[PDB]
Write an enzyme that holds these catalytic residues in place. Structure first.
Site, PDB file in Angstrom:
ATOM      1  N   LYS A 292       0.827  -1.208   0.000  1.00  0.00           N
ATOM      2  CA  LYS A 292       0.000   0.000   0.000  1.00  0.00           C
ATOM      3  C   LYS A 292       0.863   1.260   0.000  1.00  0.00           C
ATOM      4  O   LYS A 292       0.709   2.150   0.838  1.00  0.00           O
ATOM      5  CB  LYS A 292      -0.945  -0.026   1.207  1.00  0.00           C
ATOM      6  CG  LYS A 292      -1.940  -1.184   1.137  1.00  0.00           C
ATOM      7  CD  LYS A 292      -2.983  -1.146   2.234  1.00  0.00           C
ATOM      8  CE  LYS A 292      -3.974  -2.282   2.057  1.00  0.00           C
ATOM      9  NZ  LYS A 292      -3.291  -3.610   1.996  1.00  0.00           N
ATOM     10  N   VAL A 293       1.766   1.323  -0.972  1.00  0.00           N
ATOM     11  CA  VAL A 293       2.699   2.430  -1.111  1.00  0.00           C
ATOM     12  C   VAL A 293       1.944   3.752  -1.048  1.00  0.00           C
ATOM     13  O   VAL A 293       1.032   4.006  -1.840  1.00  0.00           O
ATOM     14  CB  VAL A 293       3.484   2.296  -2.433  1.00  0.00           C
ATOM     15  CG1 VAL A 293       4.570   3.349  -2.508  1.00  0.00           C
ATOM     16  CG2 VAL A 293       4.095   0.893  -2.527  1.00  0.00           C
TER      17      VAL A 293
ATOM     18  N   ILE B 234       5.705  10.122  -0.867  1.00  0.00           N
ATOM     19  CA  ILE B 234       5.935  11.114  -1.908  1.00  0.00           C
ATOM     20  C   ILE B 234       6.565  10.370  -3.088  1.00  0.00           C
ATOM     21  O   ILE B 234       7.049   9.247  -2.936  1.00  0.00           O
ATOM     22  CB  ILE B 234       6.887  12.233  -1.428  1.00  0.00           C
ATOM     23  CG1 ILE B 234       8.279  11.663  -1.141  1.00  0.00           C
ATOM     24  CG2 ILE B 234       6.314  12.896  -0.186  1.00  0.00           C
ATOM     25  CD1 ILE B 234       9.314  12.724  -0.803  1.00  0.00           C
TER      26      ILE B 234
ATOM     27  N   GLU C 186       9.474  10.536  -4.767  1.00  0.00           N
ATOM     28  CA  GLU C 186      10.846  10.078  -4.582  1.00  0.00           C
ATOM     29  C   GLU C 186      10.959   8.828  -3.714  1.00  0.00           C
ATOM     30  O   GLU C 186      11.714   7.907  -4.029  1.00  0.00           O
ATOM     31  CB  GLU C 186      11.704  11.192  -3.978  1.00  0.00           C
ATOM     32  CG  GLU C 186      12.000  12.361  -4.910  1.00  0.00           C
ATOM     33  CD  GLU C 186      10.848  13.349  -5.043  1.00  0.00           C
ATOM     34  OE1 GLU C 186      11.045  14.380  -5.718  1.00  0.00           O
ATOM     35  OE2 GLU C 186       9.757  13.107  -4.481  1.00  0.00           O
TER      36      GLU C 186
ATOM     37  N   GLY D 287     -11.609  -8.792   1.508  1.00  0.00           N
ATOM     38  CA  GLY D 287     -12.757  -8.614   2.377  1.00  0.00           C
ATOM     39  C   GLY D 287     -13.694  -9.803   2.311  1.00  0.00           C
ATOM     40  O   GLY D 287     -14.790  -9.771   2.874  1.00  0.00           O
ATOM     41  N   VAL D 288     -13.261 -10.853   1.620  1.00  0.00           N
ATOM     42  CA  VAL D 288     -14.050 -12.067   1.473  1.00  0.00           C
ATOM     43  C   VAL D 288     -13.820 -12.994   2.661  1.00  0.00           C
ATOM     44  O   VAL D 288     -12.682 -13.256   3.051  1.00  0.00           O
ATOM     45  CB  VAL D 288     -13.676 -12.807   0.169  1.00  0.00           C
ATOM     46  CG1 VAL D 288     -14.465 -14.105   0.054  1.00  0.00           C
ATOM     47  CG2 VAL D 288     -13.947 -11.905  -1.030  1.00  0.00           C
TER      48      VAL D 288
ATOM     49  N   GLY E 153     -16.760 -10.465   5.834  1.00  0.00           N
ATOM     50  CA  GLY E 153     -18.154 -10.538   5.422  1.00  0.00           C
ATOM     51  C   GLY E 153     -18.491 -10.683   3.949  1.00  0.00           C
ATOM     52  O   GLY E 153     -19.624 -11.038   3.614  1.00  0.00           O
TER      53      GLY E 153
HETATM   54  O1  LIG Z   1       4.366  14.533   3.616  1.00  0.00           O
HETATM   55  C1  LIG Z   1       5.369  13.875   3.787  1.00  0.00           C
HETATM   56  C2  LIG Z   1       5.558  12.787   4.727  1.00  0.00           C
HETATM   57  C3  LIG Z   1       6.775  12.221   4.897  1.00  0.00           C
HETATM   58  O2  LIG Z   1       7.000  11.382   5.811  1.00  0.00           O
HETATM   59  N1  LIG Z   1       7.866  12.563   4.044  1.00  0.00           N
HETATM   60  C4  LIG Z   1       9.153  11.834   4.190  1.00  0.00           C
HETATM   61  O3  LIG Z   1      10.105  12.724   4.693  1.00  0.00           O
HETATM   62  C5  LIG Z   1      11.380  12.543   4.054  1.00  0.00           C
HETATM   63  C6  LIG Z   1      11.715  13.805   3.305  1.00  0.00           C
HETATM   64  O4  LIG Z   1      13.043  13.665   2.825  1.00  0.00           O
HETATM   65  P1  LIG Z   1      13.722  14.793   1.942  1.00  0.00           P
HETATM   66  O5  LIG Z   1      14.332  15.869   2.967  1.00  0.00           O
HETATM   67  O6  LIG Z   1      12.782  15.386   0.928  1.00  0.00           O
HETATM   68  O7  LIG Z   1      14.861  14.119   1.262  1.00  0.00           O
HETATM   69  C7  LIG Z   1      11.237  11.257   3.254  1.00  0.00           C
HETATM   70  O8  LIG Z   1      11.670  10.108   3.996  1.00  0.00           O
HETATM   71  C8  LIG Z   1       9.759  11.198   2.947  1.00  0.00           C
HETATM   72  O9  LIG Z   1       9.285   9.872   2.660  1.00  0.00           O
HETATM   73  C9  LIG Z   1       7.739  13.617   3.074  1.00  0.00           C
HETATM   74  O10 LIG Z   1       8.677  13.973   2.393  1.00  0.00           O
HETATM   75  N2  LIG Z   1       6.490  14.185   2.998  1.00  0.00           N
HETATM   76  O1  LIG Z   2      -9.359  -2.672   1.281  1.00  0.00           O
HETATM   77  C1  LIG Z   2      -8.534  -3.517   1.556  1.00  0.00           C
HETATM   78  C2  LIG Z   2      -7.220  -3.681   0.971  1.00  0.00           C
HETATM   79  C3  LIG Z   2      -6.442  -4.736   1.307  1.00  0.00           C
HETATM   80  O2  LIG Z   2      -5.343  -4.965   0.738  1.00  0.00           O
HETATM   81  N1  LIG Z   2      -6.845  -5.655   2.327  1.00  0.00           N
HETATM   82  C4  LIG Z   2      -5.913  -6.755   2.717  1.00  0.00           C
HETATM   83  O3  LIG Z   2      -6.481  -7.969   2.315  1.00  0.00           O
HETATM   84  C5  LIG Z   2      -6.303  -8.992   3.303  1.00  0.00           C
HETATM   85  C6  LIG Z   2      -7.663  -9.392   3.820  1.00  0.00           C
HETATM   86  O4  LIG Z   2      -7.466 -10.520   4.660  1.00  0.00           O
HETATM   87  P1  LIG Z   2      -8.671 -11.257   5.390  1.00  0.00           P
HETATM   88  O5  LIG Z   2      -9.273 -12.301   4.330  1.00  0.00           O
HETATM   89  O6  LIG Z   2      -9.694 -10.295   5.929  1.00  0.00           O
HETATM   90  O7  LIG Z   2      -8.045 -12.032   6.493  1.00  0.00           O
HETATM   91  C7  LIG Z   2      -5.313  -8.402   4.291  1.00  0.00           C
HETATM   92  O8  LIG Z   2      -3.963  -8.733   3.956  1.00  0.00           O
HETATM   93  C8  LIG Z   2      -5.561  -6.916   4.191  1.00  0.00           C
HETATM   94  O9  LIG Z   2      -4.451  -6.118   4.642  1.00  0.00           O
HETATM   95  C9  LIG Z   2      -8.129  -5.541   2.955  1.00  0.00           C
HETATM   96  O10 LIG Z   2      -8.514  -6.349   3.778  1.00  0.00           O
HETATM   97  N2  LIG Z   2      -8.870  -4.463   2.550  1.00  0.00           N
END
Ligand SMILES: O=C1CC(=O)N([C@@H]2O[C@H](COP(=O)(O)O)[C@@H](O)[C@H]2O)C(=O)N1
Ligand SMILES: O=C1CC(=O)N([C@@H]2O[C@H](COP(=O)(O)O)[C@@H](O)[C@H]2O)C(=O)N1
EC number: 4.1.1.23
Lengths: 218, 217
Positions: free
Chosen positions: A65-66, A69, A71, A174-175, A179
């Site tokens: 779930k990236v 920012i 970079e 969610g299966v 539910g």
């Molecule tokens: O809004 C946000 C949240 C955050 O954690 N960060 C983090 O803060 C750091 C900023 O680094 P930099 O000074 O831009 O090189 C990185 O590790 C980002 O992932 C950000 O830049 N913006």
């Molecule tokens: O909306 C979302 C996204 C997602 O990735 N997941 C992921 O899907 C899996 C659901 O697992 P479970 O069948 O409820 O045990 C977990 O790894 C959650 O982190 C979720 O439940 N809801």
């Protein structure tokens, strides 16, 4: 699109190598696609992806779930694909530039990006749901081909499928535990994601076989 | 939380040798390091314990936790088991997901930092419009630590207004992203700095220089 065996993806969220490997091995004949997330990766290391590939003939979707920012997103994607992940899941709420960063790395490295639109838990109704349709539309505009939508909200999953079109690939969690119904979910999703209903079962293989039996006509 | 020189190092280098070397070169200027996925996914979670062994610094795990409650709980447990003192959580996924993190933090003696508005351009699309409400949610939930954008001083100031002077606020986007150290500290308790320090020709001078610009602050 990836050919997911039995339209069933295992969400392997067990947190110790031995149990995770045992359960995945037991359902190997029913599932060839495994979703590995942070619960397991932060507990056993990125090398767990390598171990799964070595032991099983399964594709690996890194559910990270990236949501950083641009970079930082690029660095996360590079590290994840370097480890052997076939695809990575990215959040769309942080915006287009953050998603594009992931798409660029995926293109360069020959891997895939899955865009998470709406989530399945109750809290998703607070902020995510209201932005979900636009996040999906954004994904389509950016060229995203793979998506993740909620089994717990059939109406929302249906709308998401409409937005992305029939050609896009859609997987849905969610299966079971949360539910959602397997068959109903497959009306819109190409594959269902199942975690606890399988990995916490006394006999994971039987749980997987049972789920597949209920959707055999699909 | 008492952050030395109000400066938190964002250690996003992706190899153990460089990460340890650069952090060591600026260790006299800090006592708090933010470790994120770039380093953790490249070298493993054991890197956190290594930093504590070599620097005895405070460690903030910037994992922008953004999953369902059940998974968030597992992520926090694994993170704190690795030795992190705090973890950064996204507020966009809702109250239940944040509460899951707060529960684990309370159980293991750690802190949760709630990320409201982000610093990059894309944040204007969906996050910004929900940021004030996310901050109020944090207040309702009892959250005491927050993260706001250095790149938008007016938004950072608003976040401070919502959470109050008692809450702790840290802010990224200083330097490389365009945020100014001094201006950011008008509202945030500490600034987060990554590339401007770890990518500089001489990290030590960069850190020393940064602290010099905020000398009387
Ligand atoms: O809004 C946000 C949240 C955050 O954690 N960060 C983090 O803060 C750091 C900023 O680094 P930099 O000074 O831009 O090189 C990185 O590790 C980002 O992932 C950000 O830049 N913006
Ligand atoms: O909306 C979302 C996204 C997602 O990735 N997941 C992921 O899907 C899996 C659901 O697992 P479970 O069948 O409820 O045990 C977990 O790894 C959650 O982190 C979720 O439940 N809801």
């Amino acid at each position: 699109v990836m050919d997911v065996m039995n339209r069933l993806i295992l969400a392997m969220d067990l947190m110790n190598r031995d149990d995770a490997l045992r359960v995945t091995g037991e359902v190997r004949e029913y599932i060839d696609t495994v979703k590995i997330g942070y619960p397991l990766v932060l507990s056993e290391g990125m090398d767990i992806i390598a171990e799964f590939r070595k032991r099983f003939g399964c594709r690996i979707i890194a559910d990270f779930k990236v949501a950083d920012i641009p970079e930082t997103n690029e660095k996360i994607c590079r590290a994840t694909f370097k480890a052997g992940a076939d695809a990575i899941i990215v959040h769309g709420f942080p915006g287009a530039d953050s998603v594009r960063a992931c798409l660029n790395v995926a293109e360069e490295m020959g891997r895939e990006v899955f865009l998470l639109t709406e989530m399945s838990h109750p809290g998703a109704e607070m902020f995510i749901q209201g932005a979900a349709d636009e996040i999906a539309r954004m994904g389509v505009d950016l060229g995203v081909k793979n998506y993740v939508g909620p089994s717990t909200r059939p109406e929302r999953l249906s709308r998401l499928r409409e937005i992305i079109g029939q050609d896009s690939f859609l997987i849905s969690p969610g299966v079971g535990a949360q539910g959602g119904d397997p068959g109903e979910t497959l009306r819109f999703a190409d594959a269902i994601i199942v975690g606890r209903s399988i990995y916490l079962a006394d006999n994971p293989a039987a749980a997987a076989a049972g789920a597949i039996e209920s959707i055999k006509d699909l």
